[PDB]
Design a protein around this ligand. Structure first.
Ligand SMILES: [Mg+2]
Lengths: 48, 63
């Protein structure tokens, strides 16, 4: 909460760039890949 | 316009097609003007004493 929260949030949004450019090199819809990759990572945890 | 071009930019580096964004903006512009219309106050339902005031209030604003 407060100020130093928005920073972390936009930091977590940044790290997501590696999977994006990984997928965009593969010619995939990087948005579709990540939305589904985060969704599967909210359950099946550390392997997706 | 510039922030809209900036908001597009971030979404492009994400890997999204521009035309689908531009389309995605216009249907999102049509929902903004629609809420404004349904919510905007009106000076037509006014008497003569209160219409010449609202016109001053806008004059004030712009100045
Ligand atoms: Mg003005």
């Amino acid at each position: 909460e407060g100020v130093q929260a928005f920073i972390w949030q936009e930091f977590a949004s940044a790290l997501e760039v590696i999977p994006t450019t990984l997928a965009e090199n593969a010619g995939l819809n990087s948005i579709k890949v990540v939305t589904e990759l985060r969704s599967k990572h909210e359950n099946g945890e550390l392997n997706d | 316009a510039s922030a809209l071009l900036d908001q597009a930019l971030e979404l492009i580096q994400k890997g999204i097609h521009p035309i689908k964004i531009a389309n995605g903006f216009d249907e999102a512009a049509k929902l903004a003007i629609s809420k404004l219309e349904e919510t905007c106050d009106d000076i037509s339902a006014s008497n003569d004493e209160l219409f010449r005031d609202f016109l001053l209030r806008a004059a004030k604003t712009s100045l």
